[PDB]
């Protein structure tokens with residue numbers, strides 16, 4: 001299996017709210033649940049659906065931004081990385 005990561009508490013709370021029922025993940029799983037979270041809460045822009053609006057949301061605190069594009073993979077990996085236990 002791919003490497004296992006441990007989300008810090010704030011990220012863990014987000015992943016669980018999206019439906020995760022464990023505390024240890026592969027990066028693929030973290031990405032999956034983040035997508036599910038964004039979709040369920042409809043944080044994406046209705047007309048430009050690759051844009052995520054995350055002000056007034058834990059995701060914004062986690063990523064340190066008010067908006068981002070799902071196309072920004074390197075940035076998203078970095079934002080996730082600062083929310084994993086080293």
Ligand SMILES: CCOc1cc(C(C)(C)C)ccc1C1=N[C@@](C)(c2ccc(Cl)cc2)[C@@](C)(c2ccc(Cl)cc2)N1
Nearest residue numbers: 031032034035038039044049050070072073074076077
């Ligand atoms: C929630 C919407 O997600 C996506 C939407 C679209 C459309 C433009 C077709 C709308 C396209 C792709 C996506 C889309 N890209 C993915 C695959 C992605 C996988 C890896 C990285 Cl590093 C980044 C993104 C994923 C799972 C995602 C979105 C957001 C986050 Cl924070 C995490 C995962 N969703």
